[PDB]
Amino acid sequence: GLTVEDLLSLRQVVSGNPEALAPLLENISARYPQLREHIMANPEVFVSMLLEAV
Amino acid sequence: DARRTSRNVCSNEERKRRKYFHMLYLVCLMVHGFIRNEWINSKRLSRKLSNLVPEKVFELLHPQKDEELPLRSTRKLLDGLKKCMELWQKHWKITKKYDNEGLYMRTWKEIEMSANNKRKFKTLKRSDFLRAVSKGHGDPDISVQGFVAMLRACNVNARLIMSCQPPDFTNMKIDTSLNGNNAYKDMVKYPIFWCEVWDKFSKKWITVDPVNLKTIEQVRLHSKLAPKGVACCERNMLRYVIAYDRKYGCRDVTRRYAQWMNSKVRKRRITKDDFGEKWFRKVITALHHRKRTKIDDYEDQYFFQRDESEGIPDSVQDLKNHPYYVLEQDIKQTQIVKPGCKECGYLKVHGKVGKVLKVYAKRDIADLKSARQWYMNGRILKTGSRCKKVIKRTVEEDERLYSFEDTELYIPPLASASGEITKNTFGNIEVFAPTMIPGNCCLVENPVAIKAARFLGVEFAPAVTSFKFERGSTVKPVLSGIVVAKWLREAIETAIDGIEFI
DNA sequence: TTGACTCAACATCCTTTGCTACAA
DNA sequence: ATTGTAGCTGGATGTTGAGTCA
């Protein structure tokens, strides 16, 4: 469950700028402690969410 | 400390964060491939690139079926592919250098420091990508992607192939420095993206790298695209080769490219353990937007044979955590070789003349548990069961070990009419398996489930589901809840719901 | 340049129902 | 006072990197 602001970047970076993943993931994962556990058990969720509004 | 750095290992906290980050990063990469694959299918782009391919060449891409020798058709296919490789070199009028390691594997140190500093976010949108491909302006990645887009616009079954390079979570080094010498030239020696094309006549995928190595090949055991040499693999650790198709498929096509999938590469995937196995399978499933074809069957047949032909590895460390094989010497004390079974191979030990080790297939190894151990899976020993092995163990004690077929499923007695459970000497029911729950009762796990039952004065039994180990010493049982007759469940669930009133 | 070693410091797995001393 | 409570697992095996040597 992310802000609309970050999810914009995540989608933009993932689809057209994956060369810039490293710091954005570093940043976002530091600001979203929960994400850690989310990815671990619900990857398909995070996936479909990234493909949503794509 | 200096000793902390001598042995160049990191903390367990780091191990887990690297492991997670690896996964996170991997997902993003794979999703990137999936989205890029979409862009390739772009109809506006398609009709443009289609024009780059002469009628002659188009005809070679769909050769007429040859009865007497299907090979002659494969030949014609390969020819069209080659000519396509050529006019693409011609079309792509500018190649750029990668800006900073492209999508090649970054080191942990590089990632830690990356956050720290700003960079110029040269934004790429979907349109930009199309315009780039049609003008022939871009780095080697965009190039092959455009090439794929061209082949698809000639109605050939062309895959985008992406070798995902997340950081190595198997890398436990605190210092992750790299050799600066010839660093670029060695990184670009092998591509990250390439192409696979389906040969219907021979029923195999053809491997096509039109941009980097500029070759077309029919991988059998070796691939020219699997990076080789310590130097190169510093930025190109091959472990997730993913294939995306026209119809929005997504297949883990690594097996093709990894000479040593099972020994060498397994060790390097998030897939080494069983949790990661399922985890990855989920990511694939989430990217696979088509139903299975006969082609999927053909490729699986190929992969199946590739596993068969890899065979016993050449080196001891490679037979460490192997999915199919174990060294005689690595058979755990709690294991025996299934009756009438030998080794299935041998291993020439590198370093000592004529030194050889017996190798067993994991499937010929049987796991034994003790009387107690089995009971922790709701299992008791059969009437006429003799044990298979004996071990000395301290609390020195000869503990006997039994095979699965010596064991019987433990069925506990039914609860009485009043719902009276028959319990142990401590006044509880041991419940370590769904099997251990009486067949007319239910397990209700709740911190207050015990309190609730007592309040309703109804007949129950506390559930010992596991044991907690600790304190100065000794063990204490974890009572996680209640076993009660099924017909009292909703009564209990109600009480539980209103505990604050009890 | 190769892996099989041994070393040394961790990590992870298997265990699977308290006991004594003392302050109140 | 004779109860309520604070304070006393772990050993065998597996994994990781360095360093050395044939």
Rg (chain A; Cα; Å): 11
Q: Which residue of B has its CA nearest to A29?
A: B21
Residue B468, SS3 per DSSP: strand
A14/B103 Cα distance (integer angstroms): 12
- The Cα–Cα gap between B430 and B465 comes to 6
Homologous superfamily (CATH) of B311-367 is Rad4, beta-hairpin domain BHD1 (2.20.20.110)
Structural element, H or E, at residue B441: strand B441-445
What's the Cα-to-Cα distance from B185 to each of B223, B226, B383, rounded to whole Å? 20, 16, 70
H/E run at residue B22:
helix B12-40
Phi, psi of B159 (to 5 degrees): -95, 145
Domain with CATH 3.90.260.10 in chain B: 1-310
Domain with CATH 3.30.60.290 in chain B: 368-409
How far is CA B253 from each of CA B7, B189, B326, rounded to the nearest angstrom? 36, 21, 26
Domain B1-310: which CATH class?
alpha beta
Q: How far apart are CA B85 and CA B208, in angstroms?
A: 9
Residue B271 near residue B239 (C-beta atoms within 8 A): no
What are the DSSP E strand ranges found in B374-426?
379-381, 389-392, 398-402, 407-409
SS3 B244: strand
- Token reading at B268: 């390097």
Which residues on B lie below 8 Å from A46 (Cβ)?
A: 27
Return positions of chain C under 7 A from a protein CB: 1-5, 8-12, 14-19
Nearest to B460 by CA among B476, B439, B444: B444
Cβ atoms of residues B436 and B451 within 8 Å: no
Sign for the CA dihedral angle at B246, B247, B249, B255 comes to negative
Residue for token pair 């107690």:
B372
> Can you list the alpha helix ranges (DSSP code H) found in B288-397?
294-310, 371-375
Dihedral angle computed from the Cα positions of residues B443, B445, B447 and B449, in that order, rounded to the nearest 10 degrees: -30
Q: Domain B368-409 falls in which CATH fold?
A: Wheat Germ Agglutinin (Isolectin 2); domain 1 (3.30.60)
Using CA atoms, how far apart are residues B463 and B443, in angstroms rounded to an integer?
Answer: 8
- Closest by CA to B189, choosing from B153, B228, B158, is B228
Cβ B283–A26 below 8 Å, yes or no? Answer: no
Every domain of chain A and the residues it spans: 1-54
Q: Is B5 helix (H, G, I), strand (E, B) or coil?
A: helix
Please say whether the beta carbons of B223 and B185 come within 8 A.
no
Assigned token pair, B154: 């000639």
Using CA of residue B224, residue B166, residue B138, residue B135, what is the dihedral sign?
A: positive
Residue B209 pairs in a beta bridge with: B215
The helix or strand, by DSSP H or E, that contains position B197, with its residue range, turns out to be strand B193-199
Resolution in A: 3.1
Strand C: residues with CB below 7 A: B 3-4, 7, 9, 11-12, 15-16, 230, 314-318, 349-352, 355, 370, 372-373, 376, 395, 424, 426, 428, 430, 464, 466-467, 469, 471-477
Q: Are B381 and B402 in contact (CB under 8 A)?
A: yes
| Contact state of B25 with A12 under an 8 Å Cβ cutoff | no
Which segments of chain B belong to CATH 2.20.20.110? 311-367
Q: What is the CA radius of gyration of chain B?
A: 30
Question: Angle CA(B190)–CA(B194)–CA(B200) in degrees, nearest 5?
Answer: 135
User: Whose CA is closest to B349, among B301, B393, B387, B317?
Assistant: B317
Determine which helix (DSSP H) or strand (DSSP E) holds B135, and give its type and residue range.
helix B126-135
Instruction: Please say whether the beta carbons of B138 and B95 come within 8 A.
Output: yes
Comparing CA positions, the residue from B140, B160, B137 lying closest to residue B148 is: B160
Q: What does the DSSP 8-state code read for residue B338? A: P
- Which residues have C-beta within 8 Å of that of residue B320, sequence separation ≥ 6? B267, B330
- The answer to whether the beta carbons of residues B119 and A20 sit under 8 Å apart is yes
Q: Rounded distance, CA B491 to CA B452, Å? A: 9
Among B249, B296, B215, B260, smallest CA distance to B34 is for B249
Annotate A2-26 with b (16+ C-beta within 10 A) or e (fewer). beeeebebbbbbbbbbbbbbbbbbb
∠ Cα B285 B291 B295 (to 5°): 105
Method: X-ray
Q: Which fold has domain A1-54?
A: Arc Repressor Mutant, subunit A (1.10.10)
Identify the DSSP state of B155. Answer: T
